[PDB]
């Protein structure tokens, strides 16, 4: 999944 870690970033 991608929320903010896979191909997305939580910061």
């Amino acid at each position: 999944a991608c929320d903010c870690r896979g191909d997305c970033f939580c910061g």
Side-chain angles (χ1 to χ4, degrees):
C2 160
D3 45 294
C4 63
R5 297 197 287 94
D7 62 86
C8 24
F9 58 100
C10 238

